[PDB]
A paper describes a structure:
Currently, PCV2 is the dominant pathogen causing PMWS and a number of associated diseases in pigs, severely affecting swine production worldwide. The PCV2 capsid protein is the only protein responsible for PCV2 capsid formation and the dominant immunogenic host response. In literature, the crystal structure of in vitro assembled PCV2 VLP derived from N-terminally truncated PCV2 capsid protein was determined at 2.3 Å resolution, whereas the cryo-EM structures of in vitro assembled full-length PCV2 VLP was determined at 9.6 Å resolution. These structures show that PCV2 VLPs are assembled from 60 copies of PCV2 capsid proteins with the icosahedral symmetry and several exposed loops located on the viral surface, which may serve as the immunodominant epitopes eliciting neutralization antibodies.
Single-wavelength high-resolution diffraction data was collected in Taiwan synchrotron radiation resource center (NSRRC) and scaled to a space group of P21, with the cell parameters as a = 194.12Å, b = 201.88Å, c = 231.28Å and β = 90.72° at the resolutions of 2.8Å. Surprisingly, although PCV2-His-ΔN45 does not self-assemble into particle simultaneously in solution at relatively low concentration (no more than 2mg/ml), the crystal structure of PCV2-His-ΔN45 showed that PCV2-His-ΔN45 capsid proteins indeed self-assemble into VLP within the crystals. At such conditions, the crystal structure of PCV2-His-ΔN45 displayed an icosahedral VLP structure consisting of 60 capsid protein subunits with clearly observable 2-fold, 3-fold and 5-fold axes. In our crystal structure, the interpretable densities for the PCV2-His-ΔN45 start at residue 43Ser, and the densities for most of the surface loops, such as loop-BC, loop-CD and loop-EF etc, are clearly visible and easily traced. Although the extra 20 non-authentic residues “MGSSHHHHHHSSGLVPRGSH” were introduced to the vector expressing PCV2-His-ΔN45 protein, the traceable non-authentic sequences are only two residues long 43SH44, which are located within the interior region of the PCV2 VLP.
Author numbering:
A (entry chain p), C (entry chain r), D (entry chain a), F (entry chain 9): 43 to 231
B (entry chain s), E (entry chain q): 43 to 230
Amino acid sequence: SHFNTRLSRTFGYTIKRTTVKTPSWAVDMMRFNINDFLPPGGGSNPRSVPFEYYRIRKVKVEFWPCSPITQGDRGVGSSAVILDDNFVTKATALTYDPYVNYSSRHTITQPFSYHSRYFTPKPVLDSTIDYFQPNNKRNQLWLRLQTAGNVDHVGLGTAFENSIYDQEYNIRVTMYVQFREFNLKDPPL
Amino acid sequence: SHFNTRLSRTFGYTIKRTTVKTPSWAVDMMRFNINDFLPPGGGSNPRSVPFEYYRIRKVKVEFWPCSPITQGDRGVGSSAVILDDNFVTKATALTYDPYVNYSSRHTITQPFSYHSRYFTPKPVLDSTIDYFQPNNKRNQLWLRLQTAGNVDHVGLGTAFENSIYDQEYNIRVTMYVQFREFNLKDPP
Amino acid sequence: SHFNTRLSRTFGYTIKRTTVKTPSWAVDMMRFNINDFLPPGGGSNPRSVPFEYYRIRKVKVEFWPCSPITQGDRGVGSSAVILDDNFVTKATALTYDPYVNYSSRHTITQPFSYHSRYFTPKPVLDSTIDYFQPNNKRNQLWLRLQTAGNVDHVGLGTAFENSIYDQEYNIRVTMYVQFREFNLKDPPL
Amino acid sequence: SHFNTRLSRTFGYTIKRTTVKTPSWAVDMMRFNINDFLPPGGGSNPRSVPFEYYRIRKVKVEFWPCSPITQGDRGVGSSAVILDDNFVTKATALTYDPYVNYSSRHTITQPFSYHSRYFTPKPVLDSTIDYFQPNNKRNQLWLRLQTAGNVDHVGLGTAFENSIYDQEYNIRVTMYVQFREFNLKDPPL
Amino acid sequence: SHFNTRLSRTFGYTIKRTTVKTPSWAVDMMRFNINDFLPPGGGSNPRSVPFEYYRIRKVKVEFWPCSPITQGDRGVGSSAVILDDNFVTKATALTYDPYVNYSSRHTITQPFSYHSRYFTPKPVLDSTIDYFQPNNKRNQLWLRLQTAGNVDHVGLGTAFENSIYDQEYNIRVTMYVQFREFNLKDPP
Amino acid sequence: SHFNTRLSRTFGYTIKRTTVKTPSWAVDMMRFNINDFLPPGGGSNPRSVPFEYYRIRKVKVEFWPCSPITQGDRGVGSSAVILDDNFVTKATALTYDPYVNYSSRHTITQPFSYHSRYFTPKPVLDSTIDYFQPNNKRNQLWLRLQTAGNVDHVGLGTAFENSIYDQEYNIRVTMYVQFREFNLKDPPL
């Protein structure tokens, strides 16, 4: 009846070099949607894992640095966990790191170091009120596993210190998902 | 403050005879809405149970067969608990039983045997996301008892093997409802 | 099977000023009928609580005074529990408190004090013999919940000392009613 | 990191005098919205408390009578807790107290008595279905602290008995709020 | 890291009426193949469950009778478990029940009764030699889950007594399968 | 109510390259003012946290180097904790490390190594006498949270060995502050 597993994807992230002489920050964000982890299935089974319900238990975000350990103009930034879908506005060179004081902030060391965050994300159930459940096991909502309109889950704010060089990362995101209700259809012939 | 009780209703259901040779299934669905269990009130008490809030603790679905124990071309099918309001599409003769592999499937025996299911159903709170609470007691959402526009609760998918004969049933649905906040008005 | 609840109604009561000089009392009486607490329902459920039988466990009579704490010509009277439906004849200015010697008498203070009584009342089953059951829990009679012609229960004699001024009360009566046998009918449409 | 705190505001309420001779009740209602307790902030901290999320643990509604203890035509009303945003229709002189039989009812004494209610209110999350969580602690929904458009929380029905006099109160609402996720921005210059 | 589940299918079986007057038996066989339970998937996930390996733990063969409990010319047959893929030759009216003395034989009551067998079947690994493992759990072979042409497992010989009437059945086959090695692909 | 929290800010520091032959030290200093951590408020809540009083428990000073770990001409320097606002005089290239024998000295490794200090700083109460309290919890002076002209706290002296290459750091200063007496004003509208 229940199936625990782990799903992953890796995409590129560049912070383009700047020439601002004062410390600045590249502010951005990250949501998580199961459509980017589970491709569509086939025939009478529209998704590739044949289950009717899911809930995302945990997300791990890993920033795998591309820069060599020889690279200079090293900086210091912040990742914070944003559970209400209310991120700081996307900015190229903000004059301060807007996430540093966040209670959930962790320091990102730049540009040749790993960084990861691991936490329970929340679904965006109503973007007007922006409400979510307390971090939990037994009482977490079950969601329908849809084919294509899956609800955004929510997650992570970032501010990377700008540099005189480019700072490239491979980002790997991994969802620890609990699926429920085996639904495999089996047509004949 | 609380009131636990049980509301029932009965309706007919006929699977119509077919001539298709090979096995085939009549796929349907079932929802439960308190509108059908709870008639309106009168005057200042707009509902027959004078309470402000309720939740549905359990639904029991009973299929009481009409066919006699003598009837042939007996079949086998499935019921499944669908808590997300995403049922298999309605179908007169699907070439397989699309519910048979469901985790929540129970076997239905046809045409002259009883079948029942008993589970906690879920309200349809947002049909786009289709979210629901884990099976629980004290943490279950309370709902407003509305005179008319009450929310669908969600439940049961079905597949009856088609037959050379008609297969008629009386379906008795029973909700075990918890009501809260007695609200009786008493004009003069 | 059992539903224990509480139903209330509030009504006006005025004791009109006099200019008799000698102390004199307004004598009256109080019955309790579920018709006054339970309106009619609609359709196939002719009463507003859908039960077949009932009995009244306790009644509470509250005299809420309207007169201000500054009102003079204070006076003294009596409330008595009368379970046999035989109240003292109603009177405007009787020359004594006809209830002061009753075993169940409690003293009413006038005209700005609260006064409450709490007791098991009895149904008026045969007004000629006027018999009733001893105050008791498991053995108390069950009565059919009628729409229309519910039986009086019986309870309270009052004698308020009259005064140079008007004495006004809001009276709130509360029945603690046990209901039995859920009977809800559910027609279609 | 959480911060518990208490927030208050005070406003007037008047029940205008009437000449209706029979007992009648002024019926109204109270919702609670955090926009009225937390003013707007300044600069890059939009809200005067720099937290990302809140939830309302408790609400105290206090009715502070203005009328002096010498006032006459005293009355008796009702407060009830309404958690589904479905109150009785506002009415100047209803012929009964519509809230007296409510399970959550408390008696209100008029016109010179203090009345409080204290309880967990509920956010108005969908006014079509009007659902809410059972009164809990650690499972309670978290909400985004908005600058402008916060969600009503829901709460209190009232029925005051009408009077030959004006009946004034200062009402003081007080929200016991829990805030979560410190988020202070510190731009430079 | 592992995933137990259950997969089911149903099909018809008819034993056509005869007028041979002395007792005779309709003799047949049953093999089980996971292609019939587990359809193709999509894209880069060629199977509808994304596992690399499986093994079949157990099969249940359920003969659900179609004949009504009123039907006469009732008879008596045999099922047997054949683990080595060597069944008695298919026959219409064999003059004895060739499975009745088999150690694994169970009795089949005809025509209106349920019958089931539940056992560990075996893969057909080499059909010249026809070897198989002792019924086990932790030493049981893993097999690749193929898209295409999965290996038969082996299983059930039947012998139903013939009748003056037709004898129809819905046969339900159920595979308790254990999958291993989640292998889901996720192209962008 | 006490509210315990953390406030940070980051700024650049560059030691400019020299061609002095012999070992020389760039001597400098650091004070901490909450002005630089807490932007102003708005309306009747003139500061971004709404508390009347504060004291600084602890400061973290972090030197996050910019130079790569490949850089040569490495050196060795000193930090020291100066609680009496009496720092060695600022100097481009002093011919010794003036803080090496301080009791509170920690060794700094240059130019690619992190360095931190964590200590209880002291307010500058009277810079004629320069007095401070011994490091404590329950006895530390409370100070008023001012909008504009808060009191320098004091702290850290630095001596970095000069180099043939430049040596940049991002410096992150973090104040662990305890605030007391919630004071939020809530006007209407």
